[PDB]
Amino acid sequence: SSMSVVILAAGKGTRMYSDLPKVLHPLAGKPMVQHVIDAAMKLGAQHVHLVYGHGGELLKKTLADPSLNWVLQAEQLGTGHAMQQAAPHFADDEDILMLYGDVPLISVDTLQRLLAAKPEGGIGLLTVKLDNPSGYGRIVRENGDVVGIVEHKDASDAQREINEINTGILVANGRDLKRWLSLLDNNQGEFYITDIIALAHADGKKIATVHPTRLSEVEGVNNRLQLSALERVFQTEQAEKLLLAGVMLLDPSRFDLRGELTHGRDITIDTNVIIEGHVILGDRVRIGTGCVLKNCVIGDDSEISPYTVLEDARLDANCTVGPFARLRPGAELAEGAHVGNFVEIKKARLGKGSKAGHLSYLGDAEIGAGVNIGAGTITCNYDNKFKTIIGDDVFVGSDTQLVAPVTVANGATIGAGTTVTRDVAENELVISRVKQVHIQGWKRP
Amino acid sequence: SSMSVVILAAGKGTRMYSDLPKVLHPLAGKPMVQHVIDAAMKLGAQHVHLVYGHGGELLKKTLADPSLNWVLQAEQLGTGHAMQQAAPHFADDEDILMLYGDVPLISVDTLQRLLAAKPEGGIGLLTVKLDNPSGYGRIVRENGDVVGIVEHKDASDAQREINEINTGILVANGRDLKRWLSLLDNNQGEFYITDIIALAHADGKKIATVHPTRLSEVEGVNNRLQLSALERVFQTEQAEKLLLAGVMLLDPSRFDLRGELTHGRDITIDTNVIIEGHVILGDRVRIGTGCVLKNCVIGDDSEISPYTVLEDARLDANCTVGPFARLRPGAELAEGAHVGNFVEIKKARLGKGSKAGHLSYLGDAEIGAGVNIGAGTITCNYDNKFKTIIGDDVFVGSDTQLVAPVTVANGATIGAGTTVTRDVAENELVISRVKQVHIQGWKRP
Amino acid sequence: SSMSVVILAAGKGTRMYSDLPKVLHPLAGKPMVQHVIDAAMKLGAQHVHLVYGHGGELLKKTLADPSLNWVLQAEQLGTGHAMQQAAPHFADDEDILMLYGDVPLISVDTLQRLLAAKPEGGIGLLTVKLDNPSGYGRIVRENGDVVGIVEHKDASDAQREINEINTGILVANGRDLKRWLSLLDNNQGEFYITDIIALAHADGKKIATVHPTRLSEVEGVNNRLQLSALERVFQTEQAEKLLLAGVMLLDPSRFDLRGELTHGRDITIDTNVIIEGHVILGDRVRIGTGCVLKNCVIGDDSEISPYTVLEDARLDANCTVGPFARLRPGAELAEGAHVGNFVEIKKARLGKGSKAGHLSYLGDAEIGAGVNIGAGTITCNYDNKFKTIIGDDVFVGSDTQLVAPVTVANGATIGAGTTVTRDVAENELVISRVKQVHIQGWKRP
């Protein structure tokens, strides 16, 4: 069929104490409002209408999304008024679902039930019964029949016992909806969206209701404490989905996914790992404690040792990296390569079974197979930046500075503490050798 | 009005298995007993009387606090006996409140209710009703009127149903208190402080009661498991206060504050951050996972990357530091400065927009603006310690050792692998240049 | 008396999505099934019979344990059938207890109650009453008398109210057990082990029942989410045992023990520490945040600073190591030694009060007392591997490469940036000194 959504996101997030529009605040590293858009997209939402008051410019900025239909608003004067501003935008043949930019966790199932329990020429309304309903809108039924919503405000002591409350999420045909809207008053001073419930039982239509499966689906964010609770809920969910799909998390409450994780079989992730962007892990990969991976491919059987950071990096199968290793964009390890502690790799490839074990920096480097990069080796590659190249079976002594552009051919050997400015030939040894000078019985300060 | 406090802290913390007096054990990095003192100070407590048995010397030692009035005690023989030892110390015109050194979480509100519900010539008594009261002192009321306390010990099956129990915290006028005290017996062998309740209804005075708002306010520490529970409670509280005041914590259950955090607006703190001493963070600062900050000022818009440790360090605005960076006391970054991975800074300043990106140690250094500190640069500054100075626009090649005292003037350039013992002049290049020596077809061992 | 156990571990752990047999999956770093074996050993279990279907070879492989009696099985066709396969293996004079390889948390107390509540010529049966019993085997009693087990399957609406359920764990004499077994049918198609309950009330014997003290004792693992819950339970338990025995954990929910921890008095362990293998900590040791210790001895009063990794390493008293330090097998610190940030130690000893503060790698080294290892010092010890030796009171300048085999005698001093290939004599100074070369007004690229 046909269906569009409207996302309300116009209020003042005063209690966020922020210079950033509330709805742009991230949940698992992405704007609250994008979770809602994402969901709308998953419904088949043909169009998405976003209603905003202040924060306009950097809202549409921080949200590229050229596919969206933006809707300005005088200055927050009515949640119903807001719904009026987008009213002329609803095609009469399409359903119109209403969501809030600060309720990021609303599941598709719960909406794709709402859209099924909508009575022809009527409203599908999402509701939840509360433990303590001590301040929300009551759902007022007569014979279990929805007739209208009561604000906690004007609620008799008898009504205040009504557990079931309004999530503020609901459906209706675009035609019928255009109707019910601009037939409402302002006599708080504002216009309540609540009213279109009674103003629907008015002209004899039936308003049905489904419930969300989790309370968190309809949790609204007014402040950061609330947002952090939703972050935890969201992370527990992701973690449990990975556990059930075969990934071992040594402590799923100390795990964070902010993006996507594609994975193979029998992966172990230890405590306090964070996964950002899109990470692909092969079979039998092990990630130690404290590692941060962002936009990485890690090949079958690789081991990432504790406290290793990787971003836009690639490891083939059987590699080992860490502890205390830092791989930056362009870092590439060929099959069975090893990078050790206090080693940084930038736009560099370390070939098959090559080793860089300690205290080294490698950038803008093409290194071959079976190469030994001694402790303390530095590509001195900054003066743009220049390329260092090393063939197979090369031995690079400790504390060597490779001054690029420089090429060291296969089988070459480089003595410790050597500066290399000129190219090195196959199987040639090079030793930057001076003469250590001796004073006898020297009195140390 | 006038008011003093007494802190009881004399028992044997046997179940702590410690050589340190129980009350000195830290909660959020400060002695249990200091939390209690702190609170007393916040009441306006004119004097604080501290009653102790063993542990005396290093108690008054580990607690400088020359403002305190110490009170010795034979050898724990009566909680009431203890209260006798400080009795001659209470002015008749002042209220005397009683607290315990091992109940660190007692809030001011709860005490500044206790002090309001005190009946003239009578006791204000703190109480709590328990889920399971299966071992404490019962509050025995007649017509809801407090008449005396029953030890779980001698408690009829009927009494054992009394949910409400004694926290052991209470008030009373100093005069009246001196009275009720030394009129009690020793016929456990000890003197119970419990009794002064009935010995107050005795001479026809009214004993009122307020409750603490949280159970944790009256939780006593007898062991470390108990202390750890209170640590978590205390940390959750702090975390929620920062969230509500506008700081984003990516996981408030993996956050620890052991001191004070002054903050501006829109700060993000990722998982597993610890804050010690006094930390000042400006607007829009980001602290990555695993960072430890102790006594630091971080300027607006700075980014601290994961696994970075800072102590007594200062960053101006727009600085970036980490990952894997170590800043020690005296470390200072000017506006937009960058410190990278595996870099340590001690008593050194890195000027405007200067960079130290990798594998470097800088101590006792004054470095100017626009300076590039190549990978592997070391201030060789130990032989006391001597000063290294570098002007603006200097380029320092990788793996340079700067042997202090040495001065490198503006615009100078230093080739890679250079040892610098002598001063360098404006725009002068210096290259510690030897000659790499070549053996052909060398057989590597 | 006499007693043997049987561990059932033959099903398909399909929902583990693993190439590793379910029961081999680790809990606190050791195979689920080893926890069960361990427990059996603690009972005095004279023999342990392990029944398995597929996964056979690498089961008996990954479990050396030459003490075990393995029992093959056609192909999972009956949990009772399985129990038949080991039936001919039970001595008539011994008790036979039945356990499952995927229920790792079953305590000895609960089994050493089961073995006491066994009625002569009868069954001791472990049971638990459930909050929601909505899919398990009901315990069917008549006058509170166990008569037989009902599968949730064939269970009247009336029976489905029976809270109490079958853990599947039970006892019986080996003789009697051999009996009750091979008198059962296959008319699911399989043989139910359930039946021997009614087939015991059949020949007029009494089947008693004890309960486990914790629900987690009888939790079965079918998937990784379940296993992770048990991991957390197991870790909370260990943590609380260490807290009660006197170790301070700054956050027991961010602590992991995968092995054994021997400890002395007044130890503090900060957040996110992992303990693997066997770790011995002396009195008054402090372990900072993020440290990983595996098979280490740490002497009285040592301080391990944050983010330090140690494996098969030894520290005497008063040592300090970290932050950001990496100690590998063979790493040894003598009394009061210090290792700083970005320092790696392999098969090396750093003598009394010696210091290696920054950016160094030391392997295969014997270093004496009072030695100063400057920043950036590297043992260039790889060409097998060769030994570097340094006596007392030696000063090693920064960025020195020690090319082993080399010996530096007592009181010697080594200038910064020195390569050392030859031995150094007592109190001799050595400076690898070249000449820095100067270009005036050099235009930096």
UniProtKB/Swiss-Prot annotation, chains A, B, C:
It is found in: Cytoplasm. The keyword Membrane does not apply. GO terms for cellular component: cytoplasm; membrane. SUPFAM superfamilies: Nucleotide-diphospho-sugar transferases (SSF53448), Trimeric LpxA-like enzymes (SSF51161). It is an enzyme of class 2 (transferase). Its cofactor is Mg(2+). Binds 1 Mg(2+) ion per subunit. Pathway: Nucleotide-sugar biosynthesis; UDP-N-acetyl-alpha-D-glucosamine biosynthesis; N-acetyl-alpha-D-glucosamine 1-phosphate from alpha-D-glucosamine 6-phosphate (route II): step 2/2; Nucleotide-sugar biosynthesis; UDP-N-acetyl-alpha-D-glucosamine biosynthesis; UDP-N-acetyl-alpha-D-glucosamine from N-acetyl-alpha-D-glucosamine 1-phosphate: step 1/1; Bacterial outer membrane biogenesis; LPS lipid A biosynthesis. It catalyses: alpha-D-glucosamine 1-phosphate + acetyl-CoA = N-acetyl-alpha-D-glucosamine 1-phosphate + CoA + H(+); N-acetyl-alpha-D-glucosamine 1-phosphate + UTP + H(+) = UDP-N-acetyl-alpha-D-glucosamine + diphosphate. Residues 1-224 are annotated as: Pyrophosphorylase. UDP-N-acetyl-alpha-D-glucosamine binds at residues 8-11, 22, 73, 78-79, 100-102, 137, 151, 166, 222, 328, 346, 361, 372. Mg(2+) binds at residues 102, 222. Its EC number is 2.7.7.23, 2.3.1.157. Coiled coil: none annotated. InterPro entries: Bifunctional_GlmU, GlmU-like, GlmU_C_LbH, Hexapep, Hexapep_transf_CS, MobA-like_NTP_Trfase, Nucleotide-diphossugar_trans, Trimer_LpxA-like_sf. One of its GO terms (molecular function) is UDP-N-acetylglucosamine diphosphorylase activity. Its main location: cytoplasm. One of its GO terms (biological process) is cell morphogenesis. Residues 246-445 are annotated as: N-acetyltransferase. The active site is at 358 (proton acceptor). Keywords: Acyltransferase, Cell shape, Cell wall biogenesis/degradation, Cytoplasm, Magnesium, Metal-binding, Multifunctional enzyme, Nucleotidyltransferase, Peptidoglycan synthesis, Repeat, Transferase. Residues 225-245 are annotated as: Linker. The keyword Nucleotidyltransferase applies. In the N-terminal section; belongs to the N-acetylglucosamine-1-phosphate uridyltransferase family. Catalyzes the last two sequential reactions in the de novo biosynthetic pathway for UDP-N-acetylglucosamine (UDP-GlcNAc). The C-terminal domain catalyzes the transfer of acetyl group from acetyl coenzyme A to glucosamine-1-phosphate (GlcN-1-P) to produce N-acetylglucosamine-1-phosphate (GlcNAc-1-P), which is converted into UDP-GlcNAc by the transfer of uridine 5-monophosphate (from uridine 5-triphosphate), a reaction catalyzed by the N-terminal domain. This is Bifunctional protein GlmU. It comes from Yersinia pestis (strain Pestoides F).
